[PDB]
Amino acid sequence: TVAKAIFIKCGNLGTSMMMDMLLDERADREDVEFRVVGTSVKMDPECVEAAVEMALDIAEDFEPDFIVYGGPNPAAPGPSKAREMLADSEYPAVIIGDAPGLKVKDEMEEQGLGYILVKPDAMLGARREFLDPVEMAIYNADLMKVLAATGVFRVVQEAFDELIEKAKEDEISENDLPKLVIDRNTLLEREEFENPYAMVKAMAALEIAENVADVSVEGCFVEQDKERYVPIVASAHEMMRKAAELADEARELEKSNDAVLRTPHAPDGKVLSKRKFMEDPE
């Protein structure tokens, strides 16, 4: 049959920005249908409510098997509000956030919602003297490349593909809701990379990515001297740029061996697989 879900996006995150598209890359999955609503970058308690009310507003006629909320710091005012509104609705919800979301990690099991906490999806150096729109874009391009090439996006894809199957089974229980925490070590469980050094390079990429957070936090919430915080947050961007280079390096190693894992979606939604370039998705 056909499964449906709603995506609410407040504020920006590398994972939230891509989460719904990781489910139907070519737009040929006839077995799903999604809606996307949000308040852009804004994520204060007010805008959040309005967004979740905009999702509950259309879920009435849309009737989503599950709703997903994606944004930074799920333990902050704005996002906290939205955890409430979704925990108390006739819809199974999933909250996708970053590392600060480990604070309210217990509280999320309580509210009965699923979650995808990406640690390497670090906050960017948000300081007016440094972060303008373009810098903002450049940083996201480097983070997108590290989360994709290291195989973290695969984890999110497969997590929302294993749910979309239980959604067609007309049985979405809280035991079916994912409870994930993505980090460098997560790659130690997969078989993503055939070349071991590629895994080690992807691991290093994610380690660096996770570290970008502390640098951005310090420069934005701790250092108050212009002469010190501008360079600090900028150094957080230089780090992520390198993590992106490491990610690319990992991918190229897999190209040298012709083992680049590829798992596309069949028109009916079933996840295929392949390693060799001219292999034809199995």
Which residues lie near Mg ion (CB under 5 A)? 112
| Cβ-based nearer residue to Mg ion, 176 or 248 | 176
Sole residue written with tokens 């071991």: 196
Crossing angle of helices 226-257 and 196-217, rounded to 10°: 170
Give the range of 91-99, 104-112, 166-174, 221-229 binding a second copy by CB under 8 A: 221-229
With a CB cutoff of 8 Å and minimum separation 6, the contacts of 110 are none
Query: Hey, is 133 helix, strand or coil?
Result: helix
Phi-psi region of 144 (alpha: psi -120 to 50; beta: other; left: phi over 0): alpha
> Applying CB under 8 A, does 109 fall inside the site for a second copy?
no
One residue of 84, 174, 221, 262 binding a second copy per CB under 8 A = 262
Query: Hey, is 232 helix, strand or coil?
Result: helix
β-pair partners for 70: 9, 96
> Applying CB under 8 A, does 264 fall inside the site for a second copy?
yes
| Cβ-based nearer residue to a second copy, 84 or 281 | 281
One residue of 87, 178, 207, 275 binding a second copy per CB under 8 A = 207
Quote the tokens at residue 55: 């999702």
| Cβ-based nearer residue to Mg ion, 61 or 90 | 90
- Per DSSP, helices labelled H in 162-225 are 163-166, 196-217
| Cβ-based nearer residue to a second copy, 117 or 254 | 254
> Applying CB under 8 A, does 255 fall inside the site for a second copy?
yes
- Strand segments (E) across the chain: 3-10, 32-40, 66-70, 93-97, 114-118, 179-182
Sole residue written with tokens 């308690």: 45
Contacts with a second copy in 42-71 (CB under 8 A)?
Answer: 42-43, 47, 50, 54, 58
With a CB cutoff of 8 Å and minimum separation 6, the contacts of 120 are 146, 147, 150, 152, 182, 183, 184, 206, 209, 210, 243
The partner in contact with residue 9, picked from Mg ion, a second copy, none with C-beta cut-offs of 5 to 8 angstroms by kind, is: a second copy
Q: How far is the CB of 55 from a second copy (least distance, A)?
A: 10
| Cβ-based nearer residue to Mg ion, 112 or 231 | 112
Contacts with a second copy in 122-181 (CB under 8 A)?
Answer: 126-138, 140-142, 144-145, 147-149, 151, 153-154, 157
Q: How far is the CB of 63 from Mg ion (least distance, A)?
A: 14
CA dihedral 267, 155, 146, 215 (to 10 degrees): 140
The partner in contact with residue 22, picked from a second copy, Mg ion, none with C-beta cut-offs of 5 to 8 angstroms by kind, is: a second copy
> Applying CB under 8 A, does 222 fall inside the site for a second copy?
no
Q: Cα separation of 231 and 235, whole Å?
A: 6
The partner in contact with residue 94, picked from Mg ion, a second copy, none with C-beta cut-offs of 5 to 8 angstroms by kind, is: none
Q: How far is the CB of 32 from a second copy (least distance, A)?
A: 9
| Cβ-based nearer residue to a second copy, 93 or 203 | 203
